[PDB]
Design a protein around this ligand. Structure first.
Ligand code: 3XY
Length: 466
C-alpha cells in the first residue's frame, strides 16, 4: 500500500528494528518485497556507500521510505497497463512478464559498470537507475508482486536468475542478461539450457522461490563491503540476524547457498547458542541432496573453503573431490565460465599452495600429515577424475597443458610409498573418466613421468619433432 499495519514500526533506529520489520512482514500472507528491498538498500547505502554523518545507525523514517516506495509503484503502475494483458485463472501471461522486464530494463542508466557493489536493491534502481543482473530479475518479481501477480516468482541457479510463472508455476522466462557479451534471450524459456545439461541451468534442479525464499535472496544479496579492506560490522550483524530469523522460521530449508552464507558469518563472529559453521555447511549440503538431486556445486565449495582457511587439508581435499563428483555429470557449455574459473583456481592455485605448506610442515616433523595419508591422495585423484569426466561429451574442452604442470607438481607432493597404497579398481577408488583410467599406470611410480602425464591429461597426440 503501504498498509497501516506495515507502517507502525517506523522509524527504524537500529539493526534490531530492521529485524522486527522483517519478522512482521514474514508473518504476513505475503511479505512486501518492495518495502523490504528499499529498507535494506537504504541502510546499506548509509552504512556502506556513504557513511558521512553516521553516529550509530541510519534512521529510516517512514516519510523517506514511503516516498521511495511511491516512486517505484508509480513507475510500474504507470508503465504496465494490466487491462492490455487479461489474466486467465489468476495466472500471468508471457507477454505481461515480458512487459514488466522491459519496463525495468528500459529504466536503467544507458551505460554503467554492471558489477559494481551496492547496485542490487530497489533503492539503487530508484535513486541511481542502476541494477546488477540478478537485481533486474528481483525487481521484475517485486514489480509483479506490486501489480498483484501472485504467480510470478524468482528462479535461481548458482550463477543466474530468471522467473517462473503461469499455470502451476510451470512456465519459465528470461528477464535479465547473463554474463558479459552473451546476447540476451529475454522472453524465452530456459528449456534449451536445461536440455543441454549446462551448469548454468542445473539440469532443471534450480531453485523455484516462494515469497519467503525471495526475502532470503535479498538478505543474501546484502553487501557489507565498504571497500577491498573493510566490511561494515553493522551490515554483517544485520545480515546474520536476518539469516537466523529466516532459518528459525524454516525459510532456508531449500536454500543451500543461504546456509553457507550464514555459516561463513558464524565463523567470522559466532552467535552464542547456535550451530557451529560446520554443522551449517553440512545442512547446506543436506538441502542440496534433499531438494535438488545433489546437483549443486557451491554447497561443497563453501565447505571446502572453510577447511582450507582452517588448514584441514584432508577435509578440504574431500570436499573438493565432492565438488568434482557433482560437476562430472554436467556438460561444460558456453556461459558456464564462472564455475570453470573456480575449478581452475582450486586446481591451479589453492591446492598447490596448501600442499606447498603441507610439505614444509612435513619437513618440520608433522604427524598425521595429509601428504602421508593415502586417503588424501585418493581425494586429489577423485577431484581430477570428476573434472576429466565433466569434459567428456562437452561441446567445449576443459583441460589444457596449463593444468598438467600443476597436476604433476601436486602428485609429486606425495611420496611414492603413499601413492602406492591407493587401490584403483575398475583405500580404494574407482575412476569414471577415461583420462584418469589411462593414467593409473603412471600415478604410483617413485619418479613421476611428467611428460607422459601431460600427454594423457591433454590427449596431446605428438611430441616435438627435433
Ligand atoms: N573452495 C572454495 C570456494 C568457496 C567459495 C565461496 C564463494 C562465495 N560465493 C558463493 C556463491 C554465492 N552465490 C549465491 N548465494 C546465494 N544466493 C544466490 S542466487 C545466485 C545466482 C544469481 F546471482 F542470482 F544470479 C547466486 C547466489 C555468493 C558467495 C565463492 C567461491 C568460493 N570458492
Amino acid at each position: 500500500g503501504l498498509k497501516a499495519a506495515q507502517k507502525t514500526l517506523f522509524p527504524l533506529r537500529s539493526i534490531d528494528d530492521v529485524v522486527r520489520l522483517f519478522a512482521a512482514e514474514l508473518g504476513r500472507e505475503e511479505p512486501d518485497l518492495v518495502l523490504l528491498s528499499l529498507v535494506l538498500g537504504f541502510v546499506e547505502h548509509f552504512l556502506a556507500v556513504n557513511r558521512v554523518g553516521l553516529t550509530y545507525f541510519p534512521v529510516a523514517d517512514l516519510s523517506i521510505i514511503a516516498a521511495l516506495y511511491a516512486r517505484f509503484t508509480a513507475q510500474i503502475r504507470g508503465a504496465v497497463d494490466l487491462s492490455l494483458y487479461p489474466r486467465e485463472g489468476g495466472v500471468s501471461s508471457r507477454e505481461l512478464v515480458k512487459k514488466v522486464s522491459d519496463v525495468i530494463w528500459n529504466s536503467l542508466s544507458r551505460s554503467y559498470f554492471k558489477d559494481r557493489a551496492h547496485i542490487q536493491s530497489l533503492f539503487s534502481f530508484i535513486t541511481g537507475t542502476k541494477l546488477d543482473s540478478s537485481g533486474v530479475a528481483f525487481a521484475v518479481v517485486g514489480a509483479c508482486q506490486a501489480l498483484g501477480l501472485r504467480d510470478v516468482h524468482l528462479a535461481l541457479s548458482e550463477d543466474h536468475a530468471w522467473v517462473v510463472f503461469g499455470p502451476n508455476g510451470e512456465q519459465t522466462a528470461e528477464v535479465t542478461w547473463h554474463g558479459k557479451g552473451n546476447e540476451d534471450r529475454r522472453g524465452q524459456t530456459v528449456n534449451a539450457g536445461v536440455a543441454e545439461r549446462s551448469w548454468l541451468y542445473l539440469k532443471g534442479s534450480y531453485m523455484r522461490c516462494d515469497r519467503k525464499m525471495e526475502v532470503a535472496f535479498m538478505v543474501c544479496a546484502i553487501n557489507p563491503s565498504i571497500d577491498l579492506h573493510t566490511d561494515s560490522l553493522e551490515l554483517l550483524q544485520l545480515q546474520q540476524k536476518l539469516l537466523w530469523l529466516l532459518y528459525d522460521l524454516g525459510h532456508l530449508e531449500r536454500y543451500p547457498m543461504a546456509l553457507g552464507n550464514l555459516a561463513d558469518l558464524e565463523e567470522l563472529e559466532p552467535t552464542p547458542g547456535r550451530p557451529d559453521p560446520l554443522t551449517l555447511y553440512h545442512k547446506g549440503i543436506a538441502s542440496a541432496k534433499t531438494y535438488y538431486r545433489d546437483e549443486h556445486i557451491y554447497p561443497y565449495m563453501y565447505l571446502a573453503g572453510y577447511h582450507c582457511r582452517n588448514r584441514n587439508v584432508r577435509e578440504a581435499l574431500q570436499a573438493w573431490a565432492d565438488t568434482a563428483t557433482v560437476i562430472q555429470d554436467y556438460n561444460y557449455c558456453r556461459e558456464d565460465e564462472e564455475i570453470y574459473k573456480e575449478f581452475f583456481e582450486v586446481a591451479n592455485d589453492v591446492i598447490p599452495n596448501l600442499l606447498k605448506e603441507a610439505a614444509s610442515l612435513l619437513e618440520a616433523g608433522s604427524q598425521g600429515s595429509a601428504l602421508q595419508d593415502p586417503e588424501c591422495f585418493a581425494h586429489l585423484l577423485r577431484f581430477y577424475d570428476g573434472i576429466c569426466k565433466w569434459e567428456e561429451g562437452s561441446p567445449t574442452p576443459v583441460l589444457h597443458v596449463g593444468w598438467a604442470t600443476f597436476l604433476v607438481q601436486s602428485l609429486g607432493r606425495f611420496e611414492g610409498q603413499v601413492r602406492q597404497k591407493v587401490r584403483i579398481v575398475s583405500p580404494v577408488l574407482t575412476f569414471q573418466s577415461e583420462k584418469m583410467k589411462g593414467m593409473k599406470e603412471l600415478l604410483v611410480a617413485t619418479k613421476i613421468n611428467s611428460s607422459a602425464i601431460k600427454l594423457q591429461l591433454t590427449a596431446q597426440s605428438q611430441v616435438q619433432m627435433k
